[PDB]
Every structure is written in structure tokens, then in C-alpha cells.
Design a protein around this nucleic acid. Structure first.
Lengths: 48, 46
RNA sequence: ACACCCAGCCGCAA
């Protein structure tokens, strides 16, 4: 794609079925900086 | 640590920090309920 | 100057 030169090998192409999964990075992402604090342990809490 | 201190005769009552009480937006911790029960039975025996 | 209490149960990711 970049150079336009033929690839030396010969790639294996063709259609096939793919599935999007429930797992999404926008949901799994998380960060914390001195946020809310647990009542008992006086420590950071559970879950994003 | 003495042998006579082996037996508990004055049961310590932990502060509220150990047994925090949280209102539902006044719920009591399980330990708080148990300590209410034991003081109740102590008064009954008295 | 924030607002949401906790135990249990279950599914699921590496």
C-alpha cells in the first residue's frame, strides 16, 4: 500500500465470517487519581 | 499477659470506625447488632 | 463546592 511495489510473497485472500464481541475498550478503560474513598477501609473503592 | 487476664471479664466495645453505621441514602453493621444483643443479655442477667 | 450503604448470588474476560 505504501510503496506500491509488489509484495514478494503472495497473500492468502478471501471472505470469511467475523463477529464483533461484547468486549469494548471504551468500557474496559479506567483510571484513578485520589477519587472516592471506601467508608470502612478508608481505601480506594471497587469497580470502574 | 496474666492467667487471670486469660478470661475475658470486661468485653471491649470497638469504636464506630470499626463498625461504621451507614444510612440508606441508619443501617447497623452485623457486629453492632451482635454487641446490642450481648449488652441486652448482660442487662437481662443483671 | 460533588453523590451513590452493605452483604449475598451469578455470568464473563486474561
Amino acid at each position: 500500500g505504501f510503496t506500491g511495489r509488489k509484495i514478494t510473497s503472495q497473500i492468502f485472500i478471501g471472505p470469511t465470517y467475523y463477529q464483533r464481541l461484547k468486549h469494548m475498550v471504551d468500557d474496559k478503560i479506567h483510571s484513578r487519581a485520589r477519587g472516592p474513598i471506601q467508608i470502612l477501609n478508608r481505601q480506594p473503592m471497587e469497580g470502574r | 499477659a496474666r492467667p487471670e487476664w486469660m478470661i475475658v471479664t470486661v468485653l471491649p466495645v470497638p469504636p464506630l470506625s470499626v463498625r461504621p453505621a451507614v444510612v440508606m441514602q441508619r443501617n447497623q453493621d452485623d457486629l453492632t447488632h451482635k454487641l446490642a444483643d450481648i449488652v441486652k443479655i448482660n442487662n437481662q442477667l443483671r
